[PDB]
């Protein structure tokens, strides 16, 4: 209850001391780069478990 999910990465500025990260909370996860590219959330396959196929 002290951990709150925030959402997928969208933008990351790479700085020496204090980075600045931009995610997307509650919305269509869309890339803000100038030439658009599709963003897809990634989860390690070791952890991801399809509950629908295991049921079958």
């Amino acid at each position: 209850n002290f951990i709150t999910p925030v959402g997928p990465l969208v933008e990351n500025i790479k700085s020496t001391y204090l980075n600045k990260i931009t995610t997307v909370v509650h919305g269509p996860v869309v890339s803000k780069a100038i030439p658009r590219s599709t963003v897809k959330v990634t989860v390690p396959q070791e952890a991801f478990v399809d509950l629908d196929a295991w049921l079958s």
Binding site: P8, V10, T16, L18, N19, I21, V24
Partner: peptide
């Protein structure tokens, strides 16, 4: 979309992240 902005210790976050990975605060 509603974006959120976070300020992070640069040694806490590895810059090589997949741009789409779900995050937790």
């Amino acid at each position: 979309p509603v974006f959120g902005d976070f300020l992070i210790h640069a040694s806490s976050f590895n810059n090589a992240e997949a741009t789409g990975t779900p995050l937790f605060q």
